[PDB]
Design a protein around this motif. Structure first.
Motif, PDB file in Angstrom:
ATOM      1  N   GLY B   1       0.791  -1.233   0.000  1.00 42.70           N
ATOM      2  CA  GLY B   1       0.000   0.000   0.000  1.00 42.70           C
ATOM      3  C   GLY B   1       0.811   1.264   0.000  1.00 42.70           C
ATOM      4  O   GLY B   1       1.985   1.200  -0.228  1.00 42.70           O
ATOM      5  N   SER B   2       0.190   2.363   0.431  1.00 40.77           N
ATOM      6  CA  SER B   2       0.877   3.676   0.428  1.00 40.77           C
ATOM      7  C   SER B   2       2.184   3.647   1.233  1.00 40.77           C
ATOM      8  O   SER B   2       3.106   4.298   0.831  1.00 40.77           O
ATOM      9  CB  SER B   2      -0.051   4.729   0.971  1.00 40.77           C
ATOM     10  OG  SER B   2      -0.616   4.323   2.206  1.00 40.77           O
ATOM     11  N   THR B   3       2.116   3.142   2.464  1.00 39.96           N
ATOM     12  CA  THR B   3       3.320   3.108   3.324  1.00 39.96           C
ATOM     13  C   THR B   3       4.467   2.382   2.607  1.00 39.96           C
ATOM     14  O   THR B   3       5.522   2.921   2.506  1.00 39.96           O
ATOM     15  CB  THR B   3       2.973   2.566   4.708  1.00 39.96           C
ATOM     16  OG1 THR B   3       1.815   3.278   5.119  1.00 39.96           O
ATOM     17  CG2 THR B   3       4.104   2.772   5.690  1.00 39.96           C
ATOM     18  N   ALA B   4       4.182   1.169   2.150  1.00 38.65           N
ATOM     19  CA  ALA B   4       5.204   0.401   1.424  1.00 38.65           C
ATOM     20  C   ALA B   4       5.704   1.150   0.182  1.00 38.65           C
ATOM     21  O   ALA B   4       6.859   1.085  -0.110  1.00 38.65           O
ATOM     22  CB  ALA B   4       4.623  -0.948   1.077  1.00 38.65           C
ATOM     23  N   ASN B   5       4.773   1.790  -0.521  1.00 39.61           N
ATOM     24  CA  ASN B   5       5.164   2.535  -1.739  1.00 39.61           C
ATOM     25  C   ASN B   5       6.054   3.741  -1.406  1.00 39.61           C
ATOM     26  O   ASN B   5       6.974   3.989  -2.096  1.00 39.61           O
ATOM     27  CB  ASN B   5       3.936   2.906  -2.565  1.00 39.61           C
ATOM     28  CG  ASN B   5       3.186   1.714  -3.105  1.00 39.61           C
ATOM     29  OD1 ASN B   5       3.674   0.598  -3.041  1.00 39.61           O
ATOM     30  ND2 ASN B   5       1.992   1.949  -3.615  1.00 39.61           N
ATOM     31  N   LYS B   6       5.686   4.426  -0.346  1.00 38.74           N
ATOM     32  CA  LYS B   6       6.545   5.550   0.077  1.00 38.74           C
ATOM     33  C   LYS B   6       7.931   5.061   0.520  1.00 38.74           C
ATOM     34  O   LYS B   6       8.857   5.754   0.386  1.00 38.74           O
ATOM     35  CB  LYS B   6       5.869   6.292   1.231  1.00 38.74           C
ATOM     36  CG  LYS B   6       4.711   7.192   0.812  1.00 38.74           C
ATOM     37  CD  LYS B   6       3.888   7.705   1.977  1.00 38.74           C
ATOM     38  CE  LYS B   6       2.571   8.295   1.520  1.00 38.74           C
ATOM     39  NZ  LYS B   6       1.710   8.684   2.657  1.00 38.74           N
ATOM     40  N   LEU B   7       7.956   3.859   1.079  1.00 41.18           N
ATOM     41  CA  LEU B   7       9.279   3.313   1.478  1.00 41.18           C
ATOM     42  C   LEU B   7      10.094   2.976   0.226  1.00 41.18           C
ATOM     43  O   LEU B   7      11.225   3.298   0.204  1.00 41.18           O
ATOM     44  CB  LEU B   7       9.083   2.107   2.408  1.00 41.18           C
ATOM     45  CG  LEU B   7      10.340   1.300   2.717  1.00 41.18           C
ATOM     46  CD1 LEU B   7      11.329   2.128   3.510  1.00 41.18           C
ATOM     47  CD2 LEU B   7       9.983   0.045   3.482  1.00 41.18           C
ATOM     48  N   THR B   8       9.447   2.316  -0.738  1.00 37.04           N
ATOM     49  CA  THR B   8      10.158   2.070  -2.005  1.00 37.04           C
ATOM     50  C   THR B   8      10.672   3.368  -2.622  1.00 37.04           C
ATOM     51  O   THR B   8      11.845   3.464  -2.995  1.00 37.04           O
ATOM     52  CB  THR B   8       9.236   1.327  -2.972  1.00 37.04           C
ATOM     53  OG1 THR B   8       8.839   0.099  -2.334  1.00 37.04           O
ATOM     54  CG2 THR B   8       9.973   0.997  -4.278  1.00 37.04           C
TER      55      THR B   8
END
Lengths: 77, 110
Positions: B1-8
């Protein structure tokens, strides 16, 4: 560790890297300024030497010319 | 989701920054090397200029001095030659005036 925790740590590392890139980039521009100042100084020194050499050569040539003229007038007289 | 995407996204941004820092730190080193080489060059140039200036002045001066010496001796020899022509002409004029006056006086003897 949680994904959110990893993001917080990644954001910290970004901020740290940005700071270090800014510091190093600032030093690049400071060193670029020194490099140009040195180039200007080296040309200035070459220009000063050439001018001194040329003033001295013109003086030598004038003295040789003058002493030829005087000698000539002495021998005509 | 967003959190994971922002981490990527953040991980990519870290990789970009690390590579830019590496390049910038290499540029600092390249420039630092140029600065030290130009210091050495500057000193080498100043030393060459000074030596060249001194040798050039000495050469001009030695040539001017020799010119004065040779010219002055040329006049000295010419002036001695003139003094000799003149001392001989002066002696030849006393000698001839004496001879003429003696002949005129003697012709008048009884």
């Amino acid at each position: 560790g949680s994904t959110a925790n990893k993001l917080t740590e990644a954001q910290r590392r970004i901020a740290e890297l940005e700071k270090e890139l800014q510091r190093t980039t600032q030093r690049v521009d400071q060193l670029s300024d020194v490099v140009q100042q040195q180039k200007d100084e080296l040309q200035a020194a070459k220009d000063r030497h050439a001018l001194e050499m040329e003033e001295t050569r013109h003086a030598y040539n004038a003295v040789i010319h003058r002493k030829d003229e005087v000698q000539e007038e002495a021998l005509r007289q």
